[PDB]
């Protein structure tokens, strides 16, 4: 089992061809997160390759890979491996699952130890979505994934979490807003929805008062970016 074979196998979504992988790993004291099983420039793992080749929301190598990884006794679980190159830095299988708009796959990953606060901060994403799984799910308007991330019993995502810019999901939404009537309406429903859920999930937290590394709340950030409709909406929330 060299890397080439595994990635081929996994790309084709044929779990049956993983026969002997576990034995090979345990015999040699190796893990699927090892340099050897990782693409040398990017750190792209076999599980990432799997989620990149989803067929109709699924890929039948995914759970086998997770199980083999667990059974191999891996100290640094494959589920939370991150891309290492400049362009995709921090990108995890969970981010790819959300980009692919697959709730099925998000669940499978989270149920098996996905860290819901890993940051994708590479040069390609500066579109920028706030580097966090929840902020990506919100920015791409995925209601089913957003509520799963917030409510699941394994690893609930925090609405207060911030990225390397100090941005919450609320700042991220301000960032992706267009000034088109229909887009801003949808972004407003997401902004309000998250806050409505926050009144229940974090009853005491003033999420809209959290400010940036640039000292900007979502309101002030909205003003800075020229986002009139979002700005005026955030104000009427107060008043």
Swiss-Prot record:
Disulfide bonds: none annotated. It is found in: Cell membrane; Cytoplasm; Melanosome. Residues 1-239 are annotated as: Required for interaction with SLC50A1. Ubiquitously expressed. Expressed in dorsal root ganglia, trigeminal ganglia, spinal cord (Lissauer's tract, dorsal horn and dorsal columns) (at protein level). Residues 1-239 are cytoplasmic. The modification Phosphoserine is found at residue 8. ANK repeats lie at residues 1-41, 42-88, 89-128, 129-164, 165-213, 214-239. N-glycosylated. It comes from the Eukaryota. Homotetramer. Interacts with a cAMP-dependent protein kinase type II regulatory subunit (PRKAR2A or PRKAR2B) and ACBD3. Interacts with SLC50A1; the interaction probably occurs intracellularly and depends on TRPV2 N-glycosylation. Calcium-permeable, non-selective cation channel with an outward rectification. Seems to be regulated, at least in part, by growth factors, like IGF1, PDGF and morphogenetic neuropeptide/head activator. May transduce physical stimuli in mast cells. Activated by temperatures higher than 52 degrees Celsius; is not activated by vanilloids and acidic pH. Belongs to the transient receptor (TC 1.A.4) family. TrpV subfamily. TRPV2 sub-subfamily. This is Transient receptor potential cation channel subfamily V member 2. The gene is Trpv2. The chain holds residues 75 to 319 of 761 of the full protein.
């Amino acid at each position: 089992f060299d890397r080439d074979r595994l990635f081929s196998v996994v790309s084709r979504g044929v779990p049956e061809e993983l026969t002997g992988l576990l034995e090979y790993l345990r015999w040699n004291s190796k893990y699927l997160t090892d340099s050897a099983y990782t693409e040398g420039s990017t750190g792209k793992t076999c599980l990432m390759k799997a989620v990149l080749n989803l067929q109709d929301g699924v890929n039948a190598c995914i759970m086998p890979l997770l199980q083999i990884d667990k059974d191999s006794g891996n100290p640094k679980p494959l589920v939370n491996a991150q891309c290492t190159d400049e362009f995709y830095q921090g990108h995890s299988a969970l981010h790819i699952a959300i980009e692919k708009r697959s709730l099925q796959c998000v669940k499978l990953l989270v149920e098996n130890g996905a860290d819901v606060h890993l940051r994708a901060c590479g040069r390609f994403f500066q579109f920028y979505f706030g580097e966090l799984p929840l902020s990506l799910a919100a920015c791409t308007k995925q209601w089913d994934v957003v509520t799963y991330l917030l409510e699941n019993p394994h690893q609930p995502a925090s609405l207060e979490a911030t990225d390397s810019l100090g941005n919450t999901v609320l700042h991220a939404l301000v960032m992706i807003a267009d000034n088109s009537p229909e887009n801003s309406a949808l972004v407003i429903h997401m902004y309000d929805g998250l806050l409505q859920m926050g009144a229940r999930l974090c009853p005491t937290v003033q999420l809209e008062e959290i400010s940036n590394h640039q000292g900007l709340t979502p309101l002030k950030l909205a003003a800075k970016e020229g986002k009139i409709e979002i700005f005026r909406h955030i104000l009427q929330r107060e008043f």
